[PDB]
Amino acid sequence: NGLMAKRLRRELLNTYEQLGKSGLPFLDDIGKVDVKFGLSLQLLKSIEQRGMGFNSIGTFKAIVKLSWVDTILRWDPEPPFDFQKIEISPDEIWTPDIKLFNSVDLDMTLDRTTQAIVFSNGTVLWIPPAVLKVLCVSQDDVDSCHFQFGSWVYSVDEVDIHFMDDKAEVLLDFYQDSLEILENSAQRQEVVYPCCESAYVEMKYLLALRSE
Amino acid sequence: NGLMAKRLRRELLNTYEQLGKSGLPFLDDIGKVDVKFGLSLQLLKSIEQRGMGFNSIGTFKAIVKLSWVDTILRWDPEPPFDFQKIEISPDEIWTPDIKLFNSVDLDMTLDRTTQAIVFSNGTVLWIPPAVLKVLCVSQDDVDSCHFQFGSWVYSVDEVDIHFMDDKAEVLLDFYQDSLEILENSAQRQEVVYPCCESAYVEMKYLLALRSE
Amino acid sequence: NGLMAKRLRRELLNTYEQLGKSGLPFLDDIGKVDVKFGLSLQLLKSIEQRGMGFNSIGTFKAIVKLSWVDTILRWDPEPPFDFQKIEISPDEIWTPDIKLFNSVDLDMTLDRTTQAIVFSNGTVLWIPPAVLKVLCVSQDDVDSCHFQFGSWVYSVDEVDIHFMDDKAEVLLDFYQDSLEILENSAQRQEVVYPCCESAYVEMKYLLALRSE
Amino acid sequence: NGLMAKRLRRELLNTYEQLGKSGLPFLDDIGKVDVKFGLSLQLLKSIEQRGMGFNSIGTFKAIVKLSWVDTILRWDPEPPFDFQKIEISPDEIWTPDIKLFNSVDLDMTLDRTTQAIVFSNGTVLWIPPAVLKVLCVSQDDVDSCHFQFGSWVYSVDEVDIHFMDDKAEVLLDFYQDSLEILENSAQRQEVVYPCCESAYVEMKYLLALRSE
Amino acid sequence: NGLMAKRLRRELLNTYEQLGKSGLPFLDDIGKVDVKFGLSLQLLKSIEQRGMGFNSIGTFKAIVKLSWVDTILRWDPEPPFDFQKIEISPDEIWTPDIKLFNSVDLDMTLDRTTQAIVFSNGTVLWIPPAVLKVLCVSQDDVDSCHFQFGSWVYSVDEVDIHFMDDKAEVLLDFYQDSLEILENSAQRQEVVYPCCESAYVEMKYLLALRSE
Ligand SMILES: *[C@@H]1O[C@H](CO)[C@@H](O[C@@H]2O[C@H](CO)[C@@H](O[C@@H]3O[C@H](CO)[C@@H](O)[C@H](O[C@@H]4O[C@H](CO)[C@@H](O)[C@H](O)[C@@H]4O)[C@@H]3O)[C@H](O)[C@H]2NC(C)=O)[C@H](O)[C@H]1NC(C)=O
Ligand SMILES: *[C@@H]1O[C@H](CO)[C@@H](O[C@@H]2O[C@H](CO)[C@@H](O[C@@H]3O[C@H](CO)[C@@H](O)[C@H](O[C@H]4O[C@H](CO)[C@@H](O)[C@H](O)[C@@H]4O)[C@@H]3O)[C@H](O)[C@H]2NC(C)=O)[C@H](O)[C@H]1NC(C)=O
Ligand SMILES: *[C@@H]1O[C@H](CO)[C@@H](O[C@@H]2O[C@H](CO)[C@@H](O[C@@H]3O[C@H](CO)[C@@H](O)[C@H](O)[C@@H]3O)[C@H](O)[C@H]2NC(C)=O)[C@H](O)[C@H]1NC(C)=O
Ligand SMILES: *[C@@H]1O[C@H](CO)[C@@H](O[C@@H]2O[C@H](CO)[C@@H](O)[C@H](O)[C@H]2NC(C)=O)[C@H](O)[C@H]1NC(C)=O
Numbered sequence A, B, C, D, E: 001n002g003l004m005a006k007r008l009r010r011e012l013l014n015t016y017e018q019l020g021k022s023g024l025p026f027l028d029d030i031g032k033v034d035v036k037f038g039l040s041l042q043l044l045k046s047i048e049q050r051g052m053g054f055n056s057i058g059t060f061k062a063i064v065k066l067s068w069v070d071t072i073l074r075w076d077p078e079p080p081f082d083f084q085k086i087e088i089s090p091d092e093i094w095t096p097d098i099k100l101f102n103s104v105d106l107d108m109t110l111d112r113t114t115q116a117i118v119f120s121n122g123t124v125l126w127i128p129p130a131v132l133k134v135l136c137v138s139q140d141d142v143d144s145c146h147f148q149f150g151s152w153v154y155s156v157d158e159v160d161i162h163f164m165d166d167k168a169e170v171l172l173d174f175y176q177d178s179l180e181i182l183e184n185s186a187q188r189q190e191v192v193y194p195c196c197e198s199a200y201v202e203m204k205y206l207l208a209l210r211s212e
């Protein structure tokens, strides 16, 4: 019943509406959110030499894949709320503050008009298109670019991150370019920053392309 | 009477106001939406070569034609509501989340200030201008460009798509350019993705133009 | 001027706030809006050749003049609302959905922060600055550009358009450029489009400039 | 007391919240606003030749100085409200609709995130950074540009403007560039436009720079 | 406990929601805010010569670190509110109107989606990514750029600024680029402007880079 599904969504989001979306998605003991992160390269928009040196600005189109558990968004799918999943705007719920740390701009842009899917067990799946702009090195007809992703404010004890499906690499399931990929690797690291005390998960990707 | 036309719109949109626009547009049994989709090319803004290779970024101006049934928006056209249709803003109702998947930008942009028309039987007709930016291949004086569209989060059992008027081609009813069309074809496919275990409808268009 | 003027505004706008701005501006019998439309070229921002062919993107700065009657916004200029006119934001009242049909972008842009003036008899006068981008033919030291304007969703029976001051031409009352105008004419037509059965008013301007 | 300072703001703004920001800021009826206006050039962003002719688009960074009396925002500085002034967002009160009439874009841009200061007698001082884009003439190593400002919809009987501190020139109090200023004058005129009945104040500035 | 954390935030923010975020952050006697300010250069996006002279527009990516005390945001860290800190959105609280005075655009941009952290004694720590665009001098293979930061409307008796950790230099703790830094110094100045009577704190940074 369509009415019941919309009523369900309203009941679930009432918490976020009343208490706000800030803060880890827990009402009981504060736990650790483990985010599964995937980066799916679609295409290269441009690689533009910076001045006359060996560096360049690389602009990429990708699909970013995020999954995590939100215990506030759980329900028991017994009638009249027998729904396995519901679609939800990501601006109406908590979302991980994972940012492209080494963005040449403020951050990558994610398409936050795309909906997330939340399952009855509170697992959220959000797969936003993204534009990423980073500083690359262009030498010997190769463009080497790095991407570092991490939660802005939450340490490893608050927000953890692991490769979605344990695939430590740029994903090619949405790939739609003709570029020759010469390197494609990634690593998860727990990084201490000079400004701050505790450690933060960093997902670091290295992508090397043949120059056109 | 004008006031009655406005009260009708208010009465119809009350559901969306109280409950939000997320979720398939059904109040009773949740069915399948079937979107008729038409892509009407108007002009080419630019085709710009990427680096010194064979690919280029093609920027197009089009009109995207969408029609679907919203059962929430139905009325008996008996007086004093004897209106055949009413105009409504697309941001006050559910609209399909159809994205240009292979956009070089986050997505194509639709002019969401343009009104939709809704008829008394719940059929919605929305015809927004659109800007689309895709990767083309520019070889031997021919620019070949693909456009891939589909619902982001709804599978074929939830939101289906068919070509408007069953015309599987870029439509030329708004075409105002001087470019020579060398190929113009399109296919509807039900596609299974690695990430996800259901099939999604995709409309894939191929357009080839004589290069200027 | 004054709190009573503001109280007058609140009363006039209560209908639009309660009922919404969508729908023809008619209190009682729904009639036809007659829009008076004026296009006043101010200057050329740029004319940029498209690739290596004879077409170009011409970007213009203009002032667009619009007037129409809104019978909802009428009042008797008697104590204590003895005002001949008041200023109102265009986004608080119905406005004609008149679009630049052949825009290379989604539409021309109008400055919707500029206020409209409403007179006690319901006559609205709104004169927003505008930026217009269209495809021109640049041949033989002449740039020839067209502009096609019309209501997006309203047919001739619903919204009509006529040239302001009866001048079927681009108006030069705000012209501050040095370009030589070589051709300047316009036509009002009632047009049937392949998608739809009703006739829509189209205003088509032809402008031709000596090239720099 | 800091919370009393906030209570004062809330009480002052109550009127604007209840009645709206539109309309001249007299509490109430009869009155002419007199705006003091200053244009302080900070630097040249760029001058770009238009095509191959003698015209250019000049983009400038400036600080615009505005002051006027809002009689709605007056208070007696007696305890607990013994404040000589308070800060207020310009989007919470009426501001003059003073636009760059000859803008190549819709209008100059003002940083409306910057606060205004209001004194107890109702004097408002607002000093936003601004970006101004105009069409210049570039001949004989001189770039000559003009800037025209006026209220969009208010005539001289409604909104008047005078040069701040009676300085009829581009102010250099914030000048940080290296460009040689060759001419720098301004004139206040009362202008009748063909389109419209009344006279409107126009501050017309002339600035000539030695070309780099 | 998660609910308590959220209830605490809502309680702290209740003042800002009822009275507004404008005005200095003092529950009682209005005092002087002391802002600690750090600028961490991350990378150079571009240095673009302006015209054909010796000036250039430098666009930088940085991380701005800001800290001050907000007495409104204090709480006793006693059960059930035994939390050492909570994260809060900078758009729900007062933040210093610290602007890049010599910005070539309206201002530098800060990523205001990033969360601030507030400690129980009212100390707020906010570390937004930033894009800074300024005018530089490019002579003898050196690009010299200045950056001037200050509160826009608050004088020294209202908002003070001091260098974070008393390091009067551009900080290199997030520096990810290959450019050689030739000069790096900064000074805190109290400045009186011609336009206005009080003294304002200005943090002036000098950065010189080896040209590529
Ligand atoms: C609703 O209210 C509208 C606003 O008042 C009104 O619109 C205007 O109509 C007035 C009066 O007709 C117009 O003012 C005149 O414009 C014409 C042409 O520019 C002039 O010829 C005229 O001069 C008059 O000329 C006479 C001698 O030739 C002289 O004796 C008269 O004193 C007078 O000087 C006026 O200047 C004005 O342009 C209109 N304004 C706008 C914004 O449209 C509508 O007519 C009214 N609607 C209805 C249906 O009543
Ligand atoms: C309110 O709570 C906040 C958070 O707990 C608290 O701020 C913390 O204060 C400590 C101590 O001042 C700060 O620690 C400093 O960090 C910097 C660099 O990391 C050091 O330079 C400081 O050095 C100290 O030692 C110096 C010589 O070695 C001395 O010159 C100096 O005076 C210090 O003694 C010091 O280690 C810490 O940065 C903050 N924490 C955060 C995250 O803000 C604050 O003290 C409390 N405020 C009040 C008014 O009680
Ligand atoms: C309303 O209150 C405002 C704010 O106090 C008054 O404006 C201010 O007026 C004072 C007194 O004239 C000005 O001070 C003067 O400036 C000149 C020039 O530097 C100086 O030579 C004088 O000795 C004097 O100090 C001040 O500049 C001005 N401030 C601002 C920002 O406007 C205003 O006069 C009051 N209006 C009325 C009608 O009382
Ligand atoms: C929460 O429920 C969801 C949906 O049923 C579970 O997700 C699917 O799990 C199966 C089995 O591992 C996978 O094959 C699918 O890929 C998952 N679907 C999607 C779209 O994510 C999920 O595993 C459950 N979470 C927990 C904690 O068990």
Ligand SMILES: *[C@@H]1O[C@H](CO)[C@@H](O[C@@H]2O[C@H](CO)[C@@H](O)[C@H](O)[C@H]2NC(C)=O)[C@H](O)[C@H]1NC(C)=O
Binding pocket: B119, B120, B121, B122, B123
């Ligand atoms: C709902 O009503 C609309 C409007 O009457 C129908 O659209 C008409 O459909 C017929 C048959 O397809 C077309 O020939 C006409 O062009 C349409 N009329 C207009 C004014 O557009 C629509 O078919 C109806 N939908 C259903 C499912 O019955």
Ligand SMILES: c1cnc2cc3c(cc2n1)[C@@H]1CNC[C@H]3C1
Binding pocket: A150, A151, A152, A153, A193, A195, A196, A200, E115, E116, E117, E125, E126, E127
């Ligand atoms: C509180 C607020 N902002 C932070 C920003 C950053 C960090 C910690 C923060 N803690 C380090 C880790 N994430 C990005 C930067 C550096």
Ligand SMILES: c1cnc2cc3c(cc2n1)[C@@H]1CNC[C@H]3C1
Binding pocket: A115, A116, A117, A125, A126, A127, B151, B152, B153, B193, B195, B196, B200
């Ligand atoms: C839930 C949320 N987002 C999704 C995005 C996509 C898909 C499924 C999703 N499911 C696949 C189908 N549509 C676009 C991508 C790939």
Ligand SMILES: c1cnc2cc3c(cc2n1)[C@@H]1CNC[C@H]3C1
Binding pocket: B115, B116, B117, B125, B126, B127, C150, C151, C152, C153, C193, C195, C196, C200
């Ligand atoms: C309903 C919704 N959108 C429409 C768009 C157009 C038209 C009719 C529409 N009817 C024709 C007339 N105006 C522009 C295009 C074509």
Ligand SMILES: c1cnc2cc3c(cc2n1)[C@@H]1CNC[C@H]3C1
Binding pocket: C115, C116, C117, C125, C126, C127, D150, D151, D152, D153, D193, D195, D196, D200
């Ligand atoms: C009402 C609404 N808009 C107007 C725009 C202008 C004018 C009067 C208006 N009156 C003249 C003065 N200001 C700019 C243009 C021309």
Ligand SMILES: c1cnc2cc3c(cc2n1)[C@@H]1CNC[C@H]3C1
Binding pocket: D115, D116, D117, D125, D126, D127, E150, E151, E152, E153, E193, E195, E196, E200
């Ligand atoms: C009130 C409103 N705006 C101001 C802008 C500035 C100043 C004072 C202001 N006072 C001086 C200090 N801050 C920037 C400029 C110059």
